[PDB]
Design an enzyme around this catalytic site. Structure first.
Site, PDB file in Angstrom:
ATOM      1  N   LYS D  57      65.795  35.365  48.421  1.00  0.00           N
ATOM      2  CA  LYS D  57      66.342  36.660  49.116  1.00  0.00           C
ATOM      3  C   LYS D  57      67.453  37.352  48.354  1.00  0.00           C
ATOM      4  CE  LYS D  57      64.942  36.484  53.632  1.00  0.00           C
ATOM      5  NZ  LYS D  57      64.379  35.248  54.047  1.00  0.00           N
ATOM      6  N   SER D 310      60.005  28.901  48.899  1.00  0.00           N
ATOM      7  CA  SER D 310      60.665  30.240  49.070  1.00  0.00           C
ATOM      8  C   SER D 310      62.250  29.773  49.434  1.00  0.00           C
ATOM      9  CB  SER D 310      60.125  31.129  50.027  1.00  0.00           C
ATOM     10  OG  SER D 310      59.772  30.436  51.008  1.00  0.00           O
TER      11      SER D 310
END
Lengths: 494, 494, 494, 494
Positions: D57, D310
């Site tokens: 992110k 992720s």
């Protein structure tokens, strides 16, 4: 495997897939700080001299050779070259584990031959010239099944060179324009096709040497054409005919082209050395020379501009010519014809006025019994301003001086010709001298030599460093008697 | 914080703790492949030219400056230098976030001043010479509280330079001997003290320029001493007095010392460029020059030997002197006095025998009505072997030739002096010419010029590349009339 | 080649010369930010889990194997191991190009066998246990000439492990103390001997598991000794006898030793995961567990302290035991015995008071006709403070609650035992249920289930995430009839 | 600056220009060796857990924040999050030098709050839940001029996430398909739009959790739609409504979508840990879980397939649930109902037949005066094959055994419920015991305990490592009297 005339998207895919980092490396993109300030642009140099073979050429050679079939690889590869392509092929073949034969003319310098052997290629010396070397390579390709590795005219070679532009756009994604040197066009074809797939707003400009401009000739004609002659100063771009496939891509994807002369290449070589301490071969500095000309032609300011330093394979002694050409366009010395009396002590009295400056030339041969004429060179650090101060000081000191600093024949020829034979034969003896070089060193030598002897010849040529070396003849500090030296007898004796 | 005269274990600790990688970088250790083969040793070069200031000096400057107190850092640092130390201090101060004032003589070249400013230092131009610049820096240190940053004579500067040897021993833990250039001794002190803590079996050898050998002088006397004179060719080692603390360490931890002359430094500069395509300044190639001399002196074979390429800050035009000195010790050309008749066409007939070779000199001035004497230079690629073939071919062709290739005065002086004034005044006109340079190009020019005109002057000086440029006078292809050129009138006219 | 009992300077030389970076890599040294703040020291972790075999062991194996003779390498290497040493040997042999045979017991899990095969070793399954596997390896060493590669007790293995400390001292040259786990002592011997050559002021502390403390036993006796028993939780340090040469070095160069129990290792494993998101195997977190104990024992504050995360080879399912042990020393839930009436709706009314909290246990079996007793667990985020608020809220709501949160038997055993068989046989049917897990999810399920049915059994065990799963029996939302389930019949039916 | 609904070529340009490497780093692309062999494909994992905030992110947050105006940057940025987005924003703001306020609910765990503070963000605790935290952030954005940083629905956030795919295609330019987890769609939008600009033949497949499938819902409806409920196991993808701009891109550039349940995510988490020793949070293993399902659904073989790990931000204790779910789909233990006589010594005699195996459960409570029933668990290493051998051995030994290994209620519930209260009250005393854990350890404990005492309760729950812990009651080796323990009294006493 790319064949024929691929589409732009196919070239992009092949650039991404080319396994060049098994041999080549990502090279730096560096700002040229001094030139950027002088030219009011952000000027960046892509340092392909940092490849292990000191040029970009291993990229295209590895990409093409890695794409061969297993049977082709088993039968080996071949090319004809004594230069950067040969090294690229030899290095790639060592990395791939494939036999590479490189054919070079029999007169190739041993250092070029051993460089290629050292990179891993087998070398065959054959032929009176490059054309005979290439004919033998092609014949061996037919007889023994070696695959020819072309220097530029092949889609996989082009895709390999394109990896350089894929790095470039990620190292500065805000570039405005990219300048590329053009020999046969593989580098420019690869750079242009890749850039126009990814960031087509970037302008790609080809740069050619005006005396080796086969891309410009082909663009003017609409198809590849033979140049009758090719200049040999920039060896890497000394190509008489653009490639067929490289031409197709350059005609479609280039935005502009510009040519430059050898002296501009020379000045760009000095720029690169002063700014990033890199030595470029003439072909490696060609793109910068074009960029500088283009900036002035189009009043470019405030942009981010890149050029490719494509190679660094130039012989050390070749830098003397480059420096001598650069000096003609600079103001590093004053050149003077000084007329002084033929009285003992006149040389010392003149030099005493020069003081603590660095004398670069002080050359004289007896001619007129009344007035001597000296060819005097003086190192400058402040250019024309300082030249005028020296002229004014010499005039205020009562000397007759003719300024030769802008005399093209003095700068190019006569500075190597002052001396010769006297107007009539003289009874003289000849001596050589050596002293440590420093400001005022010639003055202190002349002060020591004194006034007892009438000087009939004087030669002193100094770059301003290390040791000063004088040749002097006298009519009837290391010092050696050179009387009746054979070179003196044939060219200087009366 | 290291002070005074630290023990060896204290220097080791300070080398490990010196935060040099906030500014400096680990530089490559590269094998010199060609020289290793020629000299039968594994010869490795430590590439300190790859530092951002192109010398090792940022290591010691950052280590010393990073070790200052917060109050010292708040008051700033100062030094006096126009060279590599100034750049190291300026760059370190930018990285540390500390004000740095660098004092340099007012006559310092603008390019040196802007280099230092570009690295982040404030520059004050003051003084007629370095001594006056240093006195001002010291006075400013007293008046305003700047901390002086010394170029070598300080334990933290020495510890900083020692980080180079800590890298070296991890890059090749099988080294036999290390050669180090010596100016004031900070580099050699740091390298030697570190190596002798970690791998004391490694020999550490200092290399000095024979005309700047202050460490050797101090070793002979038992303490630092002033040199009366210092040669200026190798600026970085142009130090008149060894440091007190550097001397203590060099006397204790060095194994040997050797000196070399400027021509040996020149040859080492060419070696480094040919082998690893690096430009070394004279001080940066000094250690290699010593290593080569040491190998021969002691018949060293089969060993792993390293030297430090300590810097690359040399002006581009300085390479002309280096190349000219290298040529004197090489066999790249034949130099001939050729005596031919004064009959129209004789120049063409002689050149026709030279054929497709590269002529480097072809110089003549009318003297004797019966026989012309030409100074002829011919590029060689096979040395004395090829020289003899040219002599034999000229003799078989019926020419009277004197070989001048080993004539020191021809090589050093007379090659710049052929021409001058004729034996009596002539009615002549003067023309300059230019043609593309290639084997046989002078021949084809002379063939075109023909036999109609009697040549009374000829000058042609070529490095064998790009364009050939001829000056010729005729008695009563770019071409320009130069008749009554002022340089001709003063130095060549009868 | 190091043999016997080398001196400290010889070990330093061998550490510098060990070619470990042909296989191993420099691993990070990371600050543990949360633990550093909690413990008032700068705590650093050396991340040997980042090696390709996820432990430091490839360092020593490669250094020893690279130092073998050409004939030894031609005959291959052998060891006996199913763990980190086997992987180190297998990986090194692939990198060196040498045959490696690894003998492991026949019952070795396939995943361990394939891991070693995948790293490049040939595996022979032989033996009922490790001792029989090792006897076969030694016999094959005799019969076929394989060189045995020892897991720790060899000077070149020790020198290889020492490369970790050579990195460490350059990654933080200001360390105060280093903590090292000890199995057979190769790591600690290598770290200690290297540190004491370079920066002897640094303290080196061995950490052992209290139930596998063969170094402490040997230090107490003055020589290696056999442990009668060795705990098997920390496999990498499950060594019964210290090495002879590792003991010599540890006795001479270690500054201290400390032991810790398995629960402390568990807490250190959680620390490492929370701070740097690394999974350590129990032996890999042992050094941190010792450091934490040492900090408290000696009131250490303000220092720079490093430990070695020596390996990460722990099975995923092994982390359940580690987490369960950590929970016993934490305050993540309240455990309650709640006595409520046996009236339909009482479960719903109680849960309505719990509100939007995460229930972790809600377990009940009919016993007394008047009062039900429920085992209730509630997730806490604010520890004892929040526990007291829940107790106070339940008391203000009129419930009889006994706090079981500090009851060791409830935490260790009874939480897995609530249920069983009713006081007399019941006519009941059994149903399983599933619902998405969220705060209040059990409440909403009970609200939906309603009051129509008398619950005679209830089991609900939740970690507070994903889906809640209920087993309930009723006397005469996914839902499945489980009536007469065989497990119910044997263990829950009346 | 990208705004609105950019074209594909505009997104490509913005991906190339996003300055993410001022904060993020190029993460490895690793082959999963074991899974590749099992599934007959080359399976690669993109390791975004290696970012400094342990998720991808920071890429999108830095790209968006770096693109703000100077005035926006001067007024600061704000977001609402207690998870991976908050860390990305906080870290980026520290790297950019910009004030970042992160609003989080007041009940946020201190460790999440300090993680964000430690990355450089100012934290404001406000709100009973995320919606109230977000409303406060938006109000502060209006009142004080902070720029809101969105977690996904913004072209510059999308372009930032796209840098991951630009790395991916250069790390393996021969990929066939890429699997991407989908929360709000920023990652998938960025990956898909970039891949389809550069190599559109690559298939891009979105993976959603079946209970949080807002992209699938939106694709079915033709536009973003609200999910009524969202599962909370995978926090990073717990998004109720797809983004407007992310939906536009996913609808246009994705090739397929697949959903998976939580148990599949659990199995993928174990796969990632076993193959590359990485811990993935549930959202970080989601893409692999989809890839495995997709491979089987479409019989994919021989392809190169990548998924994005992720993120790794999962609490250590969360791995217990994941492991417990994985065990239900595996064959690591046999579960048995063993009926043996109520004669003293029967427990010992049964365990003697089990021999040197690892017992995981051995649980009993007195019920019938004639026959005891024991819940026995045995660790398996060879699955069903070994289970059958144990059953056959027990039958040949004359024991009545019911296999419960496939009984879902035994595996999910009853294994936590064996015990409870006896059929009638007993005069008993309660003792806890502890012994080192090894094969046969329970047997040796029972052999030591002997036959003198009638056992009325026995609980033993072991993971097979470290220490075994027994609770036993007897009717009228560490050992502690637990008689009248309060937990026993409420839940186990008759």
């Amino acid at each position: 495997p790319l064949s024929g005339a691929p589409e732009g998207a196919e070239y992009l895919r092949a650039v991404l897939r080319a396994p060049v980092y098994e041999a080549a490396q990502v090279t730096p993109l560096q700002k040229m700080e001094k030139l950027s300030s002088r030219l009011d642009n952000v000027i960046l140099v892509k340092r392909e001299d940092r490849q292990p073979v000191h040029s970009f050429k291993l990229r295209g050679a590895y990409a093409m050779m890695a794409g061969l079939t297993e049977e082709q690889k088993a039968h080996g590869v071949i090319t004809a070259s004594a230069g950067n392509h040969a090294q690229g092929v030899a290095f790639s073949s060592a990395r791939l584990g494939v036999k590479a034969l490189i054919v070079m003319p029999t007169a190739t310098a041993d250092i070029k031959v051993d460089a290629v052997r050292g990179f891993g290629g087998e070398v065959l010396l054959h032929g009176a010239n490059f054309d005979e070397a290439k004919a033998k390579a092609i014949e061996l390709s037919q007889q023994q099944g070696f695959t020819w590795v072309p220097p530029f005219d092949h889609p996989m070679v082009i895709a390999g060179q394109g990896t350089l532009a894929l790095e470039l756009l990620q190292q500065d994604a805000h570039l405005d324009r990219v300048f590329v040197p053009v020999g046969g066009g593989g580098l420019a074809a690869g750079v242009a096709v890749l850039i126009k797939q990814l960031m087509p707003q970037i302008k790609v400009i080809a740069v050619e040497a005006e005396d080796s401009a086969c891309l410009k000739a082909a663009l003017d004609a609409g198809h590849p054409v033979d140049l009758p002659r090719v200049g040999l100063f920039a060896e890497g771009v000394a190509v008489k005919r653009i490639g067929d496939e490289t031409f197709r891509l350059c005609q479609e994807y280039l935005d502009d082209i510009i040519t430059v002369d050898s002296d501009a290449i020379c000045a760009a070589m000095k720029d690169l050395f002063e700014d990033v301490r890199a030595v470029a071969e003439p072909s490696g500095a060609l793109a910068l020379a074009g960029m500088k000309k283009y900036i002035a032609l189009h009043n470019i300011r405030g942009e981010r501009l890149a050029h490719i330093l494509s190679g660094a394979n130039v012989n050390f002694h070749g830098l003397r010519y480059v420096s001598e050409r650069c000096e003609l366009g600079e103001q590093r010395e004053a050149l003077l014809a000084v007329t002084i009396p033929e009285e003992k002590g006149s040389f010392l009295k003149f030099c005493q006025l020069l003081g603590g400056r660095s004398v670069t030339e002080f050359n004289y041969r007896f001619a007129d019994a009344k007035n001597a004429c000296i060819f005097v060179g003086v190192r400058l650090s402040r250019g024309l301003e300082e030249r005028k101060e020296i002229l004014q000081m010499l005039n205020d000191g009562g000397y007759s001086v003719v300024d030769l600093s802008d005399d093209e024949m003095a700068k190019l020829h006569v500075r190597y010709m002052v001396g010769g034979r006297p107007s009539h034969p003289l009874q003289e003896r000849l001596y050589s001298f050596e002293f440590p070089e420093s400001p005022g060193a010639l003055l202190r030598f002349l002060n020591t030599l004194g006034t007892y002897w009438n000087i009939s010849l004087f030669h002193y040529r100094s770059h301003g460093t290390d040791y000063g070396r004088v040749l002097a003849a006298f009519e009837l500090y290391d010092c050696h008697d050179e009387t009746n030296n054979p070179a003196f007898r044939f060219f200087l004796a009366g």
